[PDB]
Design a protein around this ligand. Structure first.
Ligand code: QCO
Ligand code: CL
Ligand code: CL
Lengths: 305, 300
């Protein structure tokens, strides 16, 4: 029993974190095979971050301008290229700790583990979700840039996020490992705002199933709803629309608990209109939306990596 | 900016997880140097469990009765001894991935990361606190026994918890790495109940300081309180007494934010009285108590 916000074991990713220094700027890099990936803004100065021409800033750099440190060992940079907003520093040594990996771009609602790093050194691991507004509500300080988001599927680390910046509201913006930003963000010091966020409905339902699996049934009721009437209620409370795909994904949890997906929607509908009434679900007074249906199954079945 | 429940990177602990099998029972072990530590209940039979005599059960075991597996490699057990409720299996190979480590016994309110494991294989990492009633509100399924709680301050892993069992209420009981159980619990299937749980007051105050450092001040008020009047109101909401030690520990956060501890104590009293009124503090509608003053400072 028990349900916690749980991250993947970060060991495979820790053995990839390196420190990248370019001038006075220090951030993190991800060393996979003979390449180090890091945010391209590492080459910006104070005047540059305001309106940077990265092609022009990069052309002025030599390989030796990039100090890459893996622990206490300086890695030799033998090449440098840019792919979208990520800088790829070709190094003389292939990382002997390179796990089986893939670069995957995730969709809003999907969760991943973040290995927060400072000066190429992992300091913490947390689980978070790609918000529908494409930001992550992370925990990052100065120097965390280059810290990565990942999942593990079997023996393979799927890298899905690289941290780049913090928006004025305290939320974070980043890219996939191919340098494409999630969301309508750009890598420059300019006025940028996160769009109004919405709740990840399929994830709330998955978390309600996790609460039932853990013995919390107070919120259940005899009622059901149509998928259409639920989306009409959900749109009112800034919830993401629930699709037939989401209903199908919740199938195994519905089968395990004996509560049809539309039966759990009527519970969620009642919780949105009436509230929790002083009660808690899994030790929370809010409807938690950062556990996917797969996260619930993984944690309630003990899949190992 | 931002404040999350944050676990330590589990890599140093992952390279220590091994599977320990004794008969039909399989659980996790912690391989440090040439020793594997695991719960001593691994030697219990189905007919035992209620009143096992571990000294008698262990004396009947040979080294080859303990199958220790590190990945796909069977480790050879060359010795076995018991220290309180932990079994120490001496092996013929020192773990090459042994980090700098220490065994530390923690006090209630202290937090740590748990690397949940099944069959010697890490499946997840989460943060949790040693509750005032000495249980942990973990996430553990069958075969999680032997999974450890740890902190990693400055490259050294301080091991503070080894999972032993789940109490009837769904909470968990375990020991330090010297086998001494936290709380009035025993490694027998006898009737055992966790004492009524209480909120870790110093941790709630530390989290209120974290919210102020992150720009959230709505809950603050013009009032202060005496330490005594605070504790009189706190005990009524099942909050742990706040000691002068706790007030001193909150000193650096009080200095950083400019809010005296007893001033923050008055915001807490008001919060307890009024609730949040539809508002949230650091994305939570409850008063969070699994962040210590030390966690707040490290994360901020
Ligand atoms: C007390 C000792 C002699 O017996 C134990 C027997 C089983 C376990 N458990 C194991 O899964 C396990 C043991 N070996 C491999 N796996 C689970 C447990 O705790 N069950 C309940 C046992 C109990 C039954 C009545 C009363 C009590 F006080 C305890 C478990 C479940 C969830 C999370 N963690 C663990 C632990 C100790
Ligand atoms: Cl047995
Ligand atoms: Cl009230």
């Amino acid at each position: 029993s028990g349900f916690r916000k749980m991250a993947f074991p970060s060991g495979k990713v820790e053995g990839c974190m390196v420190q990248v220094t370019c001038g006075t700027t220090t951030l993190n890099g991800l060393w996979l095979d003979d390449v180090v990936y890091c945010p391209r803004h590492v080459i910006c100065t104070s005047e540059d971050m305001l309106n940077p021409n990265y092609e022009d800033l990069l052309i002025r750099k030599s390989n030796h301008n990039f100090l890459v440190q893996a622990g206490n060992v300086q890695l030799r940079v033998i090449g440098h290229s840019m792919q979208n907003c990520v800088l790829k520093l070709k190094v003389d040594t292939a990382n002997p700790k390179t796990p089986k990996y893939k670069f995957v771009r995730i969709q809003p609602g999907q969760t991943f583990s973040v290995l927060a790093c400072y000066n190429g050194s992992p300091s913490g691991v947390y689980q978070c979700a790609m918000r529908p507004n494409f930001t992550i509500k992370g925990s990052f300080l100065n120097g965390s840039c280059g810290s990565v988001g990942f999942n593990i599927d079997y023996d393979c680390v799927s890298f899905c996020y690289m941290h780049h910046m913090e928006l004025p509201t305290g939320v974070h913006a980043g890219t996939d490992l191919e340098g494409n930003f999630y969301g309508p963000f750009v890598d420059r010091q300019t006025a940028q705002a996160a769009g109004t966020d919405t709740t990840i409905t399929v994830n709330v339902l998955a978390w309600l199933y996790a609460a039932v699996i853990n013995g919390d049934r107070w919120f259940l009721n005899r009622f059901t709803t149509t998928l259409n009437d639920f989306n009409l209620v959900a749109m009112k409370y800034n919830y993401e629309p629930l699709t037939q795909d989401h209903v199908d994904i919740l199938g195994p949890l519905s089968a395990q608990t004996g509560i049809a997906v539309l039966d759990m929607c009527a519970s969620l509908k009642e919780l949105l209109q009436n509230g929790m009434n002083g009660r808690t679900i899994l030790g929370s007074a809010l409807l938690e939306d950062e556990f996917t249906p797969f996260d619930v199954v993984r944690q309630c079945s003990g899949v190992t990596f």
